[PDB]
Assembly symmetry: D2
Homo-oligomer: 245 residues x 4
Amino acid sequence: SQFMNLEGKVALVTGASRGIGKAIAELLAERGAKVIGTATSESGAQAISDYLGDNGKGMALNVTNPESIEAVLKAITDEFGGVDILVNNAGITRDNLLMRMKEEEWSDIMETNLTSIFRLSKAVLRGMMKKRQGRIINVGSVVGTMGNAGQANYAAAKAGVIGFTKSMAREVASRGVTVNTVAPGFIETTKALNDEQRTATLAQVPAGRLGDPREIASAVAFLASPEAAYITGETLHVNGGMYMI
Amino acid sequence: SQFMNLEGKVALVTGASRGIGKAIAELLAERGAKVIGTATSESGAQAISDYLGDNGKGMALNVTNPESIEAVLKAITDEFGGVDILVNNAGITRDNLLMRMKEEEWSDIMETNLTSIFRLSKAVLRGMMKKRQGRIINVGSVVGTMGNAGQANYAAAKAGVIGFTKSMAREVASRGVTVNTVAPGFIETDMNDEQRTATLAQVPAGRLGDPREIASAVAFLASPEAAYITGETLHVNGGMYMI
Amino acid sequence: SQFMNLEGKVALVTGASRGIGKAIAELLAERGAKVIGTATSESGAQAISDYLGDNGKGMALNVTNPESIEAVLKAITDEFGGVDILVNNAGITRDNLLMRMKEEEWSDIMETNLTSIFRLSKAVLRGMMKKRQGRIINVGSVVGTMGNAGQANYAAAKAGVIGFTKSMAREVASRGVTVNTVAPGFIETDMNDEQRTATLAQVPAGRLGDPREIASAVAFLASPEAAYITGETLHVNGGMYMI
Amino acid sequence: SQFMNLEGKVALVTGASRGIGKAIAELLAERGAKVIGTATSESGAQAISDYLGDNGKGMALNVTNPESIEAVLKAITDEFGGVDILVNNAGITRDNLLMRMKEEEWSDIMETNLTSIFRLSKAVLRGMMKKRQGRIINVGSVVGTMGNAGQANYAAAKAGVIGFTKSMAREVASRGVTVNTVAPGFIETTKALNDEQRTATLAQVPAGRLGDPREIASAVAFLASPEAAYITGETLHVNGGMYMI
Ligand SMILES: NC(=O)C1=CN([C@@H]2O[C@H](COP(=O)(O)OP(=O)(O)OC[C@H]3O[C@@H](n4cnc5c(N)ncnc54)[C@H](OP(=O)(O)O)[C@@H]3O)[C@@H](O)[C@H]2O)C=CC1
Ligand SMILES: NC(=O)C1=CN([C@@H]2O[C@H](COP(=O)(O)OP(=O)(O)OC[C@H]3O[C@@H](n4cnc5c(N)ncnc54)[C@H](OP(=O)(O)O)[C@@H]3O)[C@@H](O)[C@H]2O)C=CC1
Ligand SMILES: NC(=O)C1=CN([C@@H]2O[C@H](COP(=O)(O)OP(=O)(O)OC[C@H]3O[C@@H](n4cnc5c(N)ncnc54)[C@H](OP(=O)(O)O)[C@@H]3O)[C@@H](O)[C@H]2O)C=CC1
Ligand SMILES: NC(=O)C1=CN([C@@H]2O[C@H](COP(=O)(O)OP(=O)(O)OC[C@H]3O[C@@H](n4cnc5c(N)ncnc54)[C@H](OP(=O)(O)O)[C@@H]3O)[C@@H](O)[C@H]2O)C=CC1
């Protein structure tokens, strides 16, 4: 149908080799987008190419590296034209209580989960602004809003993603670009967590289950759609009731 | 496709004769739902029947009247079985600065915009809970979260809708029912040239939203795909407010 | 000192016979305010007069009764002049899961916990606006923001208090009146051994709050120092929720 | 009185040489605290010593420098014992629209306004946790929550401060330490802004005026008080109605 249809749009999804990023890439391609997913290695990029088939391709990207970012965008732009939908999914955890938290575990989180969104967003935004159409969608976390002990660095980065999102949303709203965050709760990815730890996390989820990566993909696809043009500066929580704002 | 597919679901959309409620009803029917839309008059109900065709029908409903609510649900339940998706859209404004605000302008807002959601939600929830599947989606307002001068009654009701939503979401999450709010900004609907520019001035998007844009957000939350969203307020306001 | 000094201010604290309302009344009187606390009975009013001594007095008030409200304000206004600080503390619970929730348990909550704030606020606001100085401070609840299963009515009312607060804050900010909400978590007050540990389990602080801790937050917002805070919800809940 | 009394508490207030940080330092000293305020130079430190008199002193601190931080805390700890109240006030702006925003304007904001709070908080928290009593109060900004065009970096840092605050609040609540943010709106400091720009900002303030630095000091003093023990993980907005959460 013409409902939630991304035909003619070019989507870049960072960290698309597995889990949530993969589900996002697959669903955007199902809705008609031409999708470039990224991994940190060529092997990972190839596997992304393998699952996207004629609907897009894989490329190697380190989101902390300016020259990598430039190489990937020029390659995309040459072949596909300018990016219409940016999904900043790539991210990491470096968990520790503050008294144990290393300088590098702080800085690596800031770099990968926050500074990267500044860099990538800045590198796609000019085209979007010229076309008067764009989507920037960040994958945040319930922890960004809720906080979590042992994840102060992660929480800071994810919270900063929202502050950036709101500010960019104000900056570019008049030129037809939206900027938003999807904040997952606990999603099956998480596996191999102790039996003890899962039940304890699950105990805080009214839904009484982990979310599926597809459920995060669906929310992203929605915000990426033409139908979602009047949503901007928003944080959409998909966490089974774990937190309610 | 199977994507955002509501075939087999029965949807009740209150206040579906025009604007946002109409757009909601049309979109849910387009995605496959069997839709009952309501108006406050039989004429209104007929027009709703006219635009839904074989995808549903219209019925007369006053959401402040227990006996009307009971009559409508029994009629729906007899013909279509139990409601799968409840869209509480019906609502009104009774604007005034507090010093000018009449007892009835307060109470009519509380009754129409808030107590109604308690009544209707309670009247569909048992079936949903038995089937272990349900959607309750409330149409709120940016004013519920932002506040607005001259709309304290409206803001109170719309804010109370969220408190109710969050509490019902906790209550029914383990039995597969989601409860959520969609909060529109300023949408081109029935409700000065001067006042519009002044409102628009607070919208970064630099336009009013279209009713279809509110419909799209509701359809999304109504979908099987939106099962892990509950207790949420989804803001569709062009950047007018950002939480 | 001149720090957090309420000398010369007239404070009305509804539901001041015990718990949080009592602690509020005592603290505002300690900071220099002339305090009228209320209870629902004359016996309760007398006890309030007993603990306030020369710093204020007690009066009987039912916040759901227009004529009671009018009688109390005229009496205050005659004796003490117009109210400078309004603390809307009076409130109740009528807990039940939605499927068990009676029409009266809904309506009694709406009336006592929400409509009352419209009535009382409207009845003090004109004077405050004329003097270009005022404080309206509502006692909400973490449940207003968090939701709680079995308390959908309460949550709706307490959430609606915020919508009202934000709208009134916009309406009266230019005339020097602030309107705010203090949202307690679980506080040691009248309201199982099992249920307490379960509630405590959700409090990082690992204890219930003291009524005095809610009093302190109210006194702060009531102060001249808090003039640039308005439309705010100040959460005092030991980490139970974090917005 | 015993109401809002900080006698016996040691307070460290970063960036206390002027405006909000100065007003904070003065008010905490008025309520009985022993106050160490900091500036980036010895001259600035001396002026802080001059206004605090016998109620505290000034020290030179660069909050982006680990060795500076260590030197200041050891000096405080030697003389006054361990810090009871930490006020992270030091911060900067590096304003620009994203397309003009330099790598350094991003990174300098992250370093000064966010990473600094990780470093300083970590360096005081052990003592607080051992004593089972502490206050960490961050000076954020309405922009952290509201977003602002031309301030995406600032907004990201200030938003990240909240994510960090919430997480630290969960981590240390059981050991009697609170962690909170005070978020000022537009405060008279701001001066020498165009006549045009002020009216435009003021137009968004229902209160119809800028806030006074003292009004931010009062909120901080409140949260620093024993009376505020049951407030943690909170963001207290003092913005004249400019934004309402
Ligand atoms: N899992 C959960 O419960 C939750 C997840 N989070 C967020 O969801 C997003 C994805 O989550 P999840 O599916 O669990 O993550 P995964 O670890 O499954 O996927 C990680 C992806 O990120 C890429 N990546 C890591 N570092 C870099 C880098 N420096 N440059 C470029 N790419 C990099 C990886 O590439 P490669 O394949 O080469 O390793 C990989 O494709 C993240 O932003 C995460 O913070 C959100 C809520 C909770
Ligand atoms: N317009 C906007 O910008 C915004 C809309 N709001 C909310 O969206 C919802 C719909 O708004 P909008 O489409 O603009 O409203 P309209 O006035 O355009 O339509 C209102 C609908 O509700 C029905 N209705 C009114 N009172 C009752 C009642 N007592 N019982 C049953 N039905 C009733 C009306 O039926 P009939 O045709 O018979 O009168 C009509 O179908 C409302 O809840 C409103 O508060 C939310 C954000 C802002
Ligand atoms: N306890 C808690 O943990 C929390 C408290 N809440 C809120 O704080 C407020 C006070 O709570 P708490 O001190 O625990 O309550 P209590 O039941 O301990 O005291 C209630 C007070 O309100 C008065 N009151 C009750 N109904 C009316 C009425 N219809 N008209 C006038 N006064 C009335 C009572 O008077 P009388 O003595 O004559 O009955 C009493 O003085 C309430 O709004 C409550 O919802 C907020 C967060 C949680
Ligand atoms: N002004 C406003 O309207 C608003 C202010 N903000 C926030 O309030 C806080 C203070 O604001 P304001 O009073 O305007 O700030 P000022 O610029 O008046 O004060 C700046 C202070 O921070 C210190 N500082 C700057 N960089 C460093 C550094 N690297 N290491 C240590 N100290 C440093 C300065 O030291 P030195 O004296 O040596 O220069 C100075 O003492 C900041 O966090 C700011 O972001 C919050 C809301 C809006």
